[PDB]
Write a protein that binds this DNA or RNA. Structure first.
Ligand SMILES: [Mg+2]
Ligand SMILES: [Zn+2]
Ligand SMILES: [Zn+2]
Lengths: 1202, 69
RNA sequence: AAUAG
DNA sequence: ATTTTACTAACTGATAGCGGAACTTTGGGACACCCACAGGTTACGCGAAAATGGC
DNA sequence: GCCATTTTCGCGGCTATTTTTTTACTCCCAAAGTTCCGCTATCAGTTAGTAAAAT
């Protein structure tokens, strides 16, 4: 229907065209008949009838008279919904300045007229005159006159000049401006200017002036003469129960405006003294400002409730505004909510849904099937049958929900796995049954959690639920590619208990024909689960090439391991099961099943694993008791020794040998060492036991203690928590953060006393408060990321670019922090991977790196590769599939139409709650910094070289001595400048000292051309530069934190990308969060979207102008095709908030935040929104240009092309 | 639905093709090319796509044949 | 405001 | 010869119109002299950008 | 006329479920428009009766 949204100023004629009448009275409704009053705020003659196809007269009262205007009343015979669309207007007695174009800084009226805002308000507030037509006089336009001076010069000159005061004066000044003449004048003055401040001022004003010329807007439209009036049904006056009426504040504001306008007209008719008229004009301006934006001018007008009235700006803006409350999110039909319980019998694609809840949700479907099969004659009969709850209704409900998927949601929806589709199974009850294996995806536990349920209606929505959102499709984490349905808690415990090994168990040494006979022996009490036996195992191995090799052989194992092998799918080794299975081992089993067998086998295997784990956790009888907390006997001796040595240190303090700080430090170290020793003794005592073997000797066995089993299996519990249960609680911190000298020398088994419990509460409260506040901080960060990255969609397959990024193993010392395989898995090669010391092309260009090619890279000892990146993609809009690579949630190359920006933002934002020289290897030494290369050729030690045993190339043997989490991420993604940033070498050249000017110092550099560049340095700067040295560009002169903007300016796009990615990944890896770097690269790409033009060239770009990079690239391609001088630009790094606010579309920018500024700028500019991103199409109700809608939008782009 | 995405290649394209086929079996009078087995039109369309009977080109060809007739 | 996750 | 039906005339209710008096509603007036207002508020904090001030 | 310091401006997680608020105050009169009850009168619909027709 429509292809774009156009915004701009409104002329008086346009406002009159919108209007169906003029509001002349502040009347709303009669106080007896409750009918609209004529020419009032609710007039039926202006806005439409109050009843469908009726008039206030009651004369024309049917559809026979549609479109006929009653002569007695004037009310058109039509529908009542027209009162939601018909607008009105007020003819203002005096012009009024628009508050947005006056006080939304910077002021557009002031910028256009080149007069300060204070002067404009002085003219408006009737304090100072201003010259409109200077005439044949020394007076100039825009020069201010006081009343005294105005009277003086009125006597002096007379009618030669015109001087006015108020909004009429500003309108006359704006109407008399010659815009092309001003544009020429600013261009000429910019040609012959040197100061950068005046250059900025003239470039801003010139941009405004030429925007006004191009848009067709006239400046005097910024001063209102006709005021539009909203439809009444959008500001309703509706009756409540008991005769009370509820009204909108807009009615009060409009009534104030109308009353003051009528009083102004009456005063002008009475020829009142000028002071009264000036007062009335001030009040009219104040009333209109309050109606448009309350509180911007001054004291906000308040109603009888003593609270500020809500204006139109408040209608459209804010968290509670129309954009966010009603347009970006809505309340929906066919939805429900209930508490969630656990269904351990369900399959991964099934969810237990209550019968009554399904009956309410699927009601139209039940009506349709009752009508179809003849059980109900009409729809009212079907309604009666459903209300009476007949058995045939239940059969119809089963047939309806037979294969209809349903969507389950849990708030907060931190990532897309917070909504998944399931096949419903009708259950008796009122609680939703949720599959256990999906709980980790939902962050859902059964302690009172509630879930919402939605019914997809159309066939497309049903197929989207089945194909995309179904739980069996989403078993990999889109953030990292790791499985997300890994078993936890009881399952793991069961699999741990069944696969453990016991010495001299019943049935040891027995020979078993296979898993079935192991199960038979277990069920007959012949052998225990933990009996060491020999079992004939038939194992099938599916190789990389697809070879299926079957080998039968006798393996030493346990009964439980074979019984578990019974459910393992064919194609996997028995070594994955022939061990004790903790959480990590089961994770490995599922990962190998996915990597070597597929998706269906993995789903069946996961279901069987969870069934078996539950069953054998039940059969184990694992229980927690007070005797399971074994406190070591060494704890008391260690406490006594620590106390005695603390007394000795106190005695030394009283002798003056050591200071107070030393005493504090060594007491703390004493207690920390004591805690470590007690923990070690407790773990050693709890981890082992002594058993009698078959020969009768004593053997050491791993303990079957319940708490030890729970912790070791990874089901629940860790070393620190067992420490607290059976060892020492340890040193605790004060609310400010300092450590208390005496620790809690008691565990939870013994019980704390009052002081120890109070000290514990000190830290417990801090933890809870920190969680509560970081929730809001993380939410705001995630929203900002989603806004900045919402437009990134895979639009092509290959962009045909040769650029890429250099990838190397991450070395932060003597060990690898992360391997090259983990970084390269899923990325497309950009330059051929030649074998080291050889010219054979091991891996060609444009090949996805999967597990097989990762093993190939690892075997041949390759250090540095080059891969395609989203930051270096050349696509005009969005990115292409090759520059992105593998879709982590799907395992293959990313498909066209995938909204990867939203995925990146969710992947980064979801873990925000969790957020708070001697050689060690043998090889040679290479200098660049210090690098220690192994014999294979891989770089394994990267060390700094401050300004050495072995020189360059000299081999070194091992042992030779050659010689704040979430705020940090937010500051990195906002491109914040550090407080004391490092001073970097602006240009490459020879350093030279300079004249130490008072206050702060200066230095100079001589370039290769002999030109001298002067740098300004603060006094307190430990300069690392020496005269006569040719410092390269980007070299550090003064040490300090590095600004990302300086990195971009002096090193390039790759350097800033690496910096941001490394810092963010350092923060995330400190806490153990696995997030792929392509998400951070997508965000950084959205950060590098603007360029400032340095050379104007011949393209339609002004110097010093911040414009979109894609537009410049397209223009440069066109100009090169035309063989003309291209534009020269410097790319800019913006924060995610600033980048979001500086997008091309004003709908998205307004929907994000700062609605008034965005709308004011768009209105003065006359912007046009093409609806190219997701948010715009969400707001206007259209299909998003991603995924299933992608193709649709493409088709339209063809039809517009044709 | 791994077989269906293997036969089509793109999940979004598979959704669109299956939606067209399901609308043909539900709103239109077209009959299934596989045993229905008490299945909804969406599942029937997915099974037909998996069997290789229904593709985008096949649907376009049948639409062209209907237009010719 | 209070409460649940 | 009898029974069903079509035709017609009279009754009655709804309804548009009118009368007229009560009822609601609007505009004007009031002559000792009176002659400048509120009016609660705020223990935020942080970052940007925009407006002032310094020499 | 640029370098720093003070002043505004806008922002601060998502789903549920329990429940209204409260000061402040002339009177009278004449003139005008509107309403409410009662009556009239006309038209259309309904119903009862009787002749016309058919069995
Ligand atoms: Mg919970
Ligand atoms: Zn009317
Ligand atoms: Zn690309």
């Amino acid at each position: 229907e429509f292809d774009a949204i156009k915004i701009g100023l409104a002329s008086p004629d346009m406002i009159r065209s919108w209007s169906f009448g003029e509001v002349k009275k502040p009347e709303t409704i009669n106080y007896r008949t409750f009918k609209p009053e004529r020419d009032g705020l609710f007039c039926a003659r202006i806005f439409g009838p109050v009843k469908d196809y009726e008039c206030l007269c009651g004369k024309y009262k049917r559809l026979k008279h549609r479109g006929v205007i009653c002569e007695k009343c004037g009310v058109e015979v039509t529908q009542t919904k027209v009162r939601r669309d018909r607008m009105g207007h007020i003819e203002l007695a005096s012009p009024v300045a628009h508050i947005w174009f006056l006080k939304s800084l910077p002021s557009r009226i002031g910028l256009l007229m080149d007069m300060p805002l204070r002067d404009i308000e002085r003219v408006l507030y009737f304090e100072m005159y201003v010259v409109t037509e200077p005439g044949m006089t020394d007076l100039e336009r825009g020069q201010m006159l006081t009343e005294e001076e105005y009277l003086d010069r009125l006597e002096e000159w007379g009618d030669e000049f015109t001087a006015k005061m108020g909004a009429e004066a500003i309108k006359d000044l704006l109407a008399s401006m010659d815009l092309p003449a001003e544009a020429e004048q600013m261009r000429e003055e910019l040609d012959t200017t040197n100061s950068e401040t005046k250059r900025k001022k003239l470039t801003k004003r010139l941009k405004l002036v030429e925007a006004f010329v191009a848009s067709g807007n006239k400046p005097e439209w910024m001063i209102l003469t006709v005021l539009p009036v909203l439809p009444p049904d959008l500001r309703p006056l509706v009756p409540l129960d008991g005769g009370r009426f509820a009204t909108s504040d807009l009615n009060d504001l409009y009534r104030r405006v109308i009353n003051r306008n009528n009083r102004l007209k009456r005063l002008l008719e009475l020829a009142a003294p000028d002071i009264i008229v000036r007062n009335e004009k001030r009040m009219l301006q104040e009333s209109v400002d309050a109606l448009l934006d309350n509180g911007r001018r001054g004291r906000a007008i308040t109603g009888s409730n003593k609270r500020p009235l809500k204006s139109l700006a408040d209608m459209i803006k804010g968290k509670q505004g129309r954009f966010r409350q009603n347009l970006l999110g809505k309340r929906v039909d066919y939805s429900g909510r209930s508490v969630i319980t656990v269904g351990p019998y369900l399959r991964l694609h099934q969810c237990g849904l209550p019968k009554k809840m399904a009956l309410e949700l699927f009601k139209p479907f039940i009506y349709s099937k009752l009508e179809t099969r003849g059980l109900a004659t009409t729809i009212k009969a079907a309604k009666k049958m459903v209300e009476r709850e007949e058995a045939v209704v239940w059969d119809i409900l089963d047939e309806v929900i037979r294969e209809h998927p349903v969507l389950l949601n849990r708030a907060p929806t931190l990532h897309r796995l917070g909504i998944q589709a399931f096949e419903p199974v009708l259950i008796e009850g009122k609680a939703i049954q949720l599959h256990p294996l999906v709980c980790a995806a939902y962050n859902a536990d059964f302690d009172g959690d509630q879930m919402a349920v939605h019914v997809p209606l159309t066939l497309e929505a049903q197929l989207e639920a089945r194909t995309l959102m179904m739980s069996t499709n989403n078993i990999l984490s889109p953030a990292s590619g790791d499985p997300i349905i890994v078993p936890s808690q009881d399952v793991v415990l069961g699999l741990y208990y069944m696969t453990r090994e016991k010495i001299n168990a019943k049935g040891e040494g027995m020979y078993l024909t296979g898993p079935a006979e192991a199960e038979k022996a277990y069920r007959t009490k012949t052998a225990e689960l933990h009996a060491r036996v020999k079992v004939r195992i038939t194992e099938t191995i599916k190789h990389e090439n697809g070879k299926l090799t079957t080998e039968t052989k006798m393996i030493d194992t346990t009964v439980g391991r074979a019984m578990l092998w019974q459910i393992v799918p064919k194609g996997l080794p028995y070594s994955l099961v022939n061990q004790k299975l903790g959480k990590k081992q089961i994770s490995n089993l599922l990962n190998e099943a996915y990597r070597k067998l597929g998706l269906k086998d993995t789903v069946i295997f996961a279901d069987q694993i969870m069934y078996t784990g539950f069953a054998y956790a039940a059969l184990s009888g694992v229980s927690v008791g007070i005797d399971d907390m074994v406190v070591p006997a060494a704890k008391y001796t260690e406490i006594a020794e620590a106390e005695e040595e603390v007394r000795e240190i106190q005695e030394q303090f009283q002798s003056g040998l050591v200071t107070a700080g030393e005493r504090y430090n060594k007491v703390i170290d004493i207690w920390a060492s004591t805690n470590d020793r007690v923990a070690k003794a407790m773990m050693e005592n709890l981890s082992s036991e002594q058993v009698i073997n078959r020969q009768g000797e004593q053997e050491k066995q791993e303990s079957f203690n319940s708490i030890y089993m729970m912790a070791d299996s990874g089901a629940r519990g860790s070393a620190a928590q067992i420490r607290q249960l059976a060892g020492m609680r340890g040193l605790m911190a004060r609310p400010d953060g300092s450590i208390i000298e005496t620790p809690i020398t008691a565990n939870f088994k013994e019980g704390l006393n009052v002081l120890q419990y109070f000290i514990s509460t000190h830290g417990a409260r801090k933890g809870l408060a920190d969680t509560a506040l970081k929730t809001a901080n993380s939410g705001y960060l995630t929203r900002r990321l989603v806004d900045v990255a919402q437009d990134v969609v895979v639009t092509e397959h290959d962009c045909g670019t040769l650029e890429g990024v250099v990838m190397t193993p991450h070395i932060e010392g003597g060990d690898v922090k992360v391997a090259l395989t983990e970084l390269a898995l899923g990325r497309v090669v950009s330059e051929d991977i030649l074998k080291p010391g050889t010219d054979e092309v091991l891996i060609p260009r444009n090949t996805l790196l999967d597990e097989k090619w990762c093993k190939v890279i690892n075997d041949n000892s390759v250090d540095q590769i080059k891969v395609r990146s989203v930051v270096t993609c050349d696509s005009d809009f969005g990115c292409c599939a090759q520059c992105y690579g593998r879709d982590l949630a799907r395992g293959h190359l990313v498909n066209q139409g995938e909204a990867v920006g939203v995925i990146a933002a969710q992947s980064i934002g979801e873990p925000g709650t969790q957020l708070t020289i001697q050689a060690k290897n043998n090889g040679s030494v290479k200098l660049h910094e210090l690098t220690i290369i192994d014999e294979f050729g891989r770089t394994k030690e990267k060390h700094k070289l401050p300004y050495l045993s072995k020189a360059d190339g000299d081999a070194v043997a091992a042992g030779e001595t050659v010689a704040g989490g979430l705020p940090r991420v937010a500051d990195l993604f906002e491109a914040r400048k550090p407080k004391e940033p490092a001073i970097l070498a602006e240009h490459s050249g020879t350093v030279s000292f300079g004249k130490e000017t008072k206050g702060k110092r200066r230095l100079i550099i001589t370039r290769d051309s002999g030109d001298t560049y002067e740098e300004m340095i603060p006094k307190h700067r430990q300069l690392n530069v020496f005269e006569g040295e040719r410092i390269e560009r980007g070299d550090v002169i003064a040490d300090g934190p590095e600004s990302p903007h300086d990195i971009l300016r002096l090193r390039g796009i790759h350097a800033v990308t690496t910096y941001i990615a490394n810092e963010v990944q350092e923060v995330y890896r400190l806490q153990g969060v696995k997030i792929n770097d392509k998400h951070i690269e997508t965000i950084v790409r959205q950060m590098l979207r603007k360029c400032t033009i340095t050379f104007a060239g011949d393209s339609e770009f002004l110097p010093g102008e911040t414009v979109e990079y894609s537009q410049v690239k397209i223009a440069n391609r066109k100009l090169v095709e035309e063989g003309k001088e291209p534009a020269r630009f410097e790319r800019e790094l913006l924060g995610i908030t600033k980048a979001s606010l500086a997008t091309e579309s004003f709908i998205s920018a307004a929907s994000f935040q700062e609605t008034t500024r965005v709308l004011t700028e768009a209105a003065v500019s006359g912007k046009r929104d093409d609806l190219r991103g997701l948010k715009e199409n969400v707001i206007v109700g259209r299909l998003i240009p991603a995924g299933t809608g992608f193709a649709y939008h493409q088709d339209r782009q063809a039809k517009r092309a044709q | 639905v791994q077989d269906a995405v293997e036969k089509i290649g793109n999940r979004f394209d598979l959704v669109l093709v299956a939606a067209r086929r399901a609308r043909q079996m539900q709103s239109g009078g077209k009959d299934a090319l596989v045993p229905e087995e008490n299945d909804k039109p969406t599942v029937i369309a997915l099974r037909e796509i998996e069997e290789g009977l229904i593709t985008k080109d096949v649907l376009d060809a049948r639409e062209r044949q209907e237009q010719q007739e």
